[PDB]
Amino acid sequence: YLSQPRLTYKTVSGVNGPLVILDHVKFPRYAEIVHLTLPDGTKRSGQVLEVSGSKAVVQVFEGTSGIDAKKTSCEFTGDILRTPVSEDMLGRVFNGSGKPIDRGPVVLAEDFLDIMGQPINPQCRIYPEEMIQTGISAIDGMNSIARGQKIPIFSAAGLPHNEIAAQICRQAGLVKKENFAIVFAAMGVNMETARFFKSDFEENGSMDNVCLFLNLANDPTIERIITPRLALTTAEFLAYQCEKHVLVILTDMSSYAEALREVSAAREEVPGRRGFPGYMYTDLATIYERAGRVEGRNGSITQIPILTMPNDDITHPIPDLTGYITEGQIYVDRQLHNRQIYPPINVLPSLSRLMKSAIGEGMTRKDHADVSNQLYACYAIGKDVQAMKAVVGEEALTSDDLLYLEFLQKFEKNFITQGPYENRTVYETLDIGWQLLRIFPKEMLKRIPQSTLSEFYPR
Amino acid sequence: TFGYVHGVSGPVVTACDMAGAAMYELVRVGHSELVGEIIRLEGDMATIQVYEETSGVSVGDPVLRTGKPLSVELGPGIMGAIFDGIQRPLSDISSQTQSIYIPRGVNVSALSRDIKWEFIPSKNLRVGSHITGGDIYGIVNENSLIKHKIMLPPRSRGSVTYIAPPGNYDASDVVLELEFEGVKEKLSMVQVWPVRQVRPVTEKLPANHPLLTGQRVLDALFPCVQGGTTAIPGAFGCGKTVISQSLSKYSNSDVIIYVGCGERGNEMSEVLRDFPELTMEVDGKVESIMKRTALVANTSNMPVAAREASIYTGITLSEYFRDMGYHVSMMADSTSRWAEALREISGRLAEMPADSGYPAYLGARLASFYERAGRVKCLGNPEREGSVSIVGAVSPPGGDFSDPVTSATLGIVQVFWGLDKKLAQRKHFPSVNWLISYSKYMRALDEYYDKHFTEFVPLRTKAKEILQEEEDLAEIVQLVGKASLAETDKITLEVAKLIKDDFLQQNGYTPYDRFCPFYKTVGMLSNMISFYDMARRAVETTAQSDNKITWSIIREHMGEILYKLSSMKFKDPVKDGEAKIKADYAQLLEDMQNAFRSLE
Amino acid sequence: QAAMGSQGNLSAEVEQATRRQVQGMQSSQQRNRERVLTQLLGMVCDVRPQVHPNYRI
């Protein structure tokens, strides 16, 4: 606590777009939170971005319209933005500023954390082990998410990245061969989609384990920047202090990146590559890397950042800088979507670098690794045979080629195509895999050891 | 020694009343003592770049000026510790706080001052004797492997006025006192050296002694030399673990330094978890690798100054032991991660970008990095010698070689151990591409090889010729099926396979193949090439008419010889001594020549 | 009709559990209500004036 009376200033040097420049401010802090009172009694929030002597420069969260240089007062809190956190806030819905928008009370805090936090000391970081099943076969039997990795979903604009994200929140959980929570943050979301998330989470009973942050497209752009920090700040409290596993989903990081560029312009910084700040790399790492396991504690944080690829070009700095510091990718395609496949996830370009540790005896099932590798080869071959068929015709194909075409057609129809309300656990996903693999005789399943085939292949 | 904060514009803090400050000096800003550096100066004001978050810094906060620029603290206790890129012990921060986070403004001394080290003077020095820079005046006994030699700091000299007696001293005591021109300097066991400065040596020598790694491939065909510089691609599927473990476990170097630059959190954990579990036989005892290793850990979310400085912190630690007469092998986990950190700082400073957005001086910084490696004659009267090798990895976005960072690196390093992912998918390890990889030290090592082994050089020449021809024949085989093909080409194809299978391929998870001594590597290749020549002669000298030798005849006739050649890799050096393995290889050579002799 | 009833009666059961939880909170906070209030009044009554730490004169 400070127990120091706050100072309120009526001295304003000028106002320039989103910024208000104050004067005669006593020992101002950088990143200090202040509150403005306009002549009409309207209150606004803001944050100090520059303090050059007594000339404090504050960015106003809301619009600066209506602010004068004679009557507007600025109340200083004497501190920076610290988020009230508790276990009870799980099951609540908040806006970007951390305020409730679910008609519930303000959070009754157990502590206050600096939302910027600190990096996790690498000496106490534990390599990812067990798996967190998502319920979506395309990313459980092919590229599973290890309990501690960070694997993004890259999508083009217009693809159902928000519907999949909502499905993961409803279905995700532990393998279960009470301590699992999901923190969901949507940045720059439009009103129709924001309603979708809120209503879909409430109706299906999942809300008890979801902490939802909604930053709407028409909300202040600076609030969009702290939104993912508040989500992770909660995740760190829940995960590391309350000994539980937290799945954090950061939706539309591309909208975050645009908000970050806006803040950079407010500081009159010269834009870097493709208009983005030269520090975009470390800023994404600052958010992304606040995850993983820690020594001596049973909690964990995983992340599934979701990013829209501008112009569907994976080379763009946003997916490029993200992927360069994440472990593999899910990758949602367009061809599968136009073919009316849901989920439209393309297994050939996807990768989960930690899958080798996520799956196996004692974590999922003995045959997990073998089924995945054989299915991947079979799908890749089926696509190759399909390309051949288009040139040589059906009569030019042999029996083995026909089996690969049968697999290809049934793989997409049975294994990848799921529906938004069918929850397929890791064991059902593997059983579906075997149903497709039993299309082939044993001798064609070259990537599955004979011991595995004898145990699982028949029946 | 204090100034005051005048203002904050983000990560940049302007100080006032800071007239007595040098550029690239160090400051501790605010009541949390935030680490930063002074870049621009004007009047009695200074512009400070703060590495950590500046939230909460007030106008009027104190700024503590530290006279030394970014420097590495060097002394006993350096071994076995894991450091941040700016030399902050992570194993002490996590253990003195009971936290999982690195505290903001954390201030833990690089070397603990609560350890009473066993120090033995040289026993050759006396009060009144003359000592110069680089001289060794006593040794600290750290562990069973590495003796930590205490040197007089460079750029210091004079007459010795006090020598501490043998005993237990910590890093805060006074061990040696010397007076130069009436000025008395009190030295402890710890010296400080600016990280951007190159530690002086008496002379820089040519690198002639091989780096004796345990792999048959990446040695016989693509040698590295102590003091040399190489590059290794770093891709998920390349199998880089094989080189890291083989180099750190069994190398003939004395000290291993592993440098992270700014990798994924989980990747840093994998290195930190694997390394402590690695062991090697030394004097017949199994010792932990961490007793002769030092590691610098930096994740992608570490302060950019540390990620950029990490690479120079590592090599400064490397040179420190180089000056002791040790052979040091440093691996930079990803120099692409470093280059990214460097570009970020240039961006923050609003410098004009050059090639692909990188700073104009990218090449100059890389060139001066690698130039610091090499075999040297050390400073100090002990007339000792040592070396630093660099085996830094490159991982450009997209896997392309057009990125200035990989292109510049390849124009600097003399050896490239190009790895591939296709080989890993085929389960062929180590995953060496062969056609892309090269070594430019082959000439430098010709003196060593001629002196000690003689036949090695023509063997490696023939081996590369066979492998290249196998590739050259690929189009002929594809269009022919080995039907309309010369018998001499069939020898090349099938023998090249033998080489690829039972020589260049090595299985490090087997106890007999963990490490292949060079004498075994050259033994294996000698017999395979001798077979090649005998098979070529058997066909060529009989290929005229009437009664000719073909590969089908050779293969069927002496199949036991081809088997014995394949079996050669199973000669376990731990149980079968040098004389026994050579004796068995000699027997195969004789049996082999006689097998062909029976055909003529 | 049975489905609407059964967990519908459980809606009263939802209400039944809710009332019990509120009563619990009311009982718990009473046990030391005066102690928490007393400490708060002490903290506000003790002013502890201080000059800003960056004052330099």
Curated annotation (Swiss-Prot), chain A:
InterPro entries: ATP-synt_VA_C, ATPase_a/bsu_AS, ATPase_F1/V1/A1_a/bsu_N, ATPase_F1/V1/A1_a/bsu_nucl-bd, ATPase_V1-cplx_bsu, P-loop_NTPase, V-ATPase_su_B/beta. ATP binds at residue 353. It is found in: Apical cell membrane; Melanosome; Cytoplasm; Cytoplasmic vesicle, Secretory vesicle, Synaptic vesicle membrane. It holds the Pfam family ATP-synt_VA_C. GO terms for biological process: ATP metabolic process; regulation of cellular pH; synaptic vesicle lumen acidification; vacuolar acidification. PANTHER family: V-TYPE PROTON ATPASE SUBUNIT B, V-TYPE PROTON ATPASE SUBUNIT B, BRAIN ISOFORM. V-ATPase is a heteromultimeric enzyme made up of two complexes: the ATP-hydrolytic V1 complex and the proton translocation V0 complex. The V1 complex consists of three catalytic AB heterodimers that form a heterohexamer, three peripheral stalks each consisting of EG heterodimers, one central rotor including subunits D and F, and the regulatory subunits C and H. The proton translocation complex V0 consists of the proton transport subunit a, a ring of proteolipid subunits c9c'', rotary subunit d, subunits e and f, and the accessory subunits ATP6AP1/Ac45 and ATP6AP2/PRR. This is V-type proton ATPase subunit B, brain isoform. The gene is Atp6v1b2.
